[PDB]
Amino acid sequence: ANLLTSLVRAHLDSGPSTAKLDYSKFQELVLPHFGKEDAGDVQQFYDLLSGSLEVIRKWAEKIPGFAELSPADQDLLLESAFLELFILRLAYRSKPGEGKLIFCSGLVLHRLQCARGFGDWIDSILAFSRSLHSLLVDVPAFACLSALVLITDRHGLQEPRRVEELQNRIASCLKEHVAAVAGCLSRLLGKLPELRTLCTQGLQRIFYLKLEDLVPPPPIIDKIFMDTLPF
Amino acid sequence: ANLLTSLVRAHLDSGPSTAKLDYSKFQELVLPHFGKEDAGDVQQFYDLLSGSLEVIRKWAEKIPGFAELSPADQDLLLESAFLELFILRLAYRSKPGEGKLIFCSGLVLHRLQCARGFGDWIDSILAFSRSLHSLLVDVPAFACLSALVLITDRHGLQEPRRVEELQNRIASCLKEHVAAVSCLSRLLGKLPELRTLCTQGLQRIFYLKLEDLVPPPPIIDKIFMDTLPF
Numbered sequence: 387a388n389l390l391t392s393l394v395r396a397h398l399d400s401g402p403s404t405a406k407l408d409y410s411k412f413q414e415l416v417l418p419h420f421g422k423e424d425a426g427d428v429q430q431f432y433d434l435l436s437g438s439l440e441v442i443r444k445w446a447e448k449i450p451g452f453a454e455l456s457p458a459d460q461d462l463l464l465e466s467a468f469l470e471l472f473i474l475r476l477a478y479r480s481k482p483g484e485g486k487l488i489f490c491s492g493l494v495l496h497r498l499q500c501a502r503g504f505g506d507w508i509d510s511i512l513a514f515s516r517s518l519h520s521l522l523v524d525v526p527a528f529a530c531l532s533a534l535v536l537i538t539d540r541h542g543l544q545e546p547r548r549v550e551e552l553q554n555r556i557a558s559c560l561k562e563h564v565a566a567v568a569g570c571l572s573r574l575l576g577k578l579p580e581l582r583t584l585c586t587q588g589l590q591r592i593f594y595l596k597l598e599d600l601v602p603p604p605p606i607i608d609k610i611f612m613d614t615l616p617f
Numbered sequence: 618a619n620l621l622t623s624l625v626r627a628h629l630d631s632g633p634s635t636a637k638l639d640y641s642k643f644q645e646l647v648l649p650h651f652g653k654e655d656a657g658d659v660q661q662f663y664d665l666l667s668g669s670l671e672v673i674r675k676w677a678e679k680i681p682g683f684a685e686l687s688p689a690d691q692d693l694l695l696e697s698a699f700l701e702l703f704i705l706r707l708a709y710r711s712k713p714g715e716g717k718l719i720f721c722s723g724l725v726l727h728r729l730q731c732a733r734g735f736g737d738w739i740d741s742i743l744a745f746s747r748s749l750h751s752l753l754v755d756v757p758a759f760a761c762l763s764a765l766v767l768i769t770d771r772h773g774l775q776e777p778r779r780v781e782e783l784q785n786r787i788a789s790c791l792k793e794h795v796a797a798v799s800c801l802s803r804l805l806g807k808l809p810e811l812r813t814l815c816t817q818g819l820q821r822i823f824y825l826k827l828e829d830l831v832p833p834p835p836i837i838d839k840i841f842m843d844t845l846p847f
């Protein structure tokens with residue numbers, strides 16, 4: 387499809403290639419005081435979240451139809467999906483066999499280097515990475531699935547029919563791709579409860595870090611945290 | 618002197634007599650079946666937390682000087698200390714060696730009968746309980762310690778000097794008792810670990826509010842919201 391091509395283009399332009407993979411901060415081995423953190427570890431956690439939201443914004447603007455939604459619907463979709471998109475894209479891009487987290491900037495970081503900032507949550511994201519990798523989801527399928535995570539019904543949409551029309555198009559586009567390669571779906575959905583648990587673990591980690599307040603969360607992440615709490 | 622007697626009287630009147638201990642629901646063995654909490658596990662968690670409210674309020678009103686603080690400082694101290702008072706009193710009253718939780722109602726429960734409701738936090742509370750038990754803290758020392766948890770600086774106090782003056786009186790009273798019978802600074806060392814445990818309680822309530830199997834009762838919800846520094 388021209389839509390499939392557009393979706394694949396956007397996905398590949400929103401991550402690093404094997405070339406601009408940045409090992410400047412990668413330490414095979416550092417020795418953390420587990421179950422504690424300092425201001426620099428918490429700043430880095432928030433900065434990674436922030437960089438991923440900046441990058442996901444630019445990816446979304448390249449999904450045909452998305453830029454023509456009301457600005458409020460664009461924000462609402464982006465906020466509502468951000469955490470799930472962060473986890474899924476990190477899982478899909480990372481190397482769980484080498485305990486390597488690969489962030490959208492090209493930054494590579496060892497599990498042990500993420501432990502202070504992220505706590506348990508990063509161990510759980512690596513577990514989901516292994517899970518995801520075993521389903522051998524090809525790039526064009528992933529490029530569609532990530533878009534379906536974004537372009538979905540949400541309470542508060544001004545133009546929900548336009549969002550449902552676009553969701554239809556991307557669902558169609560995915561169906562057509564899995565027919566073109568057949569000559570996985572049911573098993574991908576079996577992993578979705580892990581992914582929702584991981585979204586929750588994210589909110590729990592942000593709550594924990596807001597309680598501790600070593601450094602305050604950036605305003606845009608704080609707004610997503612608050613706007614994403616059903617109470 | 619007479620303050621210590623007043624503090625001991627309040628502490629002993631705020632818990633169950635070895636008479637009113639209820640083992641009717643105690644199960645020595647469970648199969649921790651259907652893992653992942655249900656409505657009943659969350660209801661029980663909230664009910665146990667709630668059972669302490671009226672008890673701790675009545676205990677505090679029997680600490681000399683406490684009723685002489687502004688009513689707004691009384692509410693603020695009660696809300697701010699609720700979770701830590703719940704934990705510390707539970708740690709001291711429970712039998713960590715047998716994984717036995719004793720609630721202020723007299724209800725006795727095995728850790729696995731409340732692990733789904735409490736999550737990890739019960740393991741952490743029991744760890745603290747073992748720690749507390751090893752200090753062989755006598756009742757009059759504990760009667761002062763619990764009061765120091767309540768009568769402490771808090772953000773929003775109207776009369777913070779009066780609260781500090783009362784904290785000083787109870788600190789004096791404790792010091793004098795521990796001389797009459799390094800051990801002192803190890804009792805005081807428990808207040809900060811008790812705050813770290815408090816945080817896990819807020820994490821658990823946050824988690825349960827997120828999941829929303831059953832909503833927290835209004836008084837716990839208010840304490841949760843009013844004790845978040847943001």
Ligand SMILES: O=C(/C=C/c1ccccc1)Nc1cc(-c2ccnc(N3CCC(O)CC3)c2)ccn1
Nearest residue numbers: 631632633634706709710711719749750753754755
């Ligand atoms: O009725 C009770 C206790 C009621 C209570 C407890 C705390 C606050 C308010 C009321 N029965 C009961 C009471 C005790 C108890 C009673 C007195 N002391 C201790 N400690 C424990 C170990 C060391 O720290 C030193 C001694 C434990 C233990 C279990 N059940």
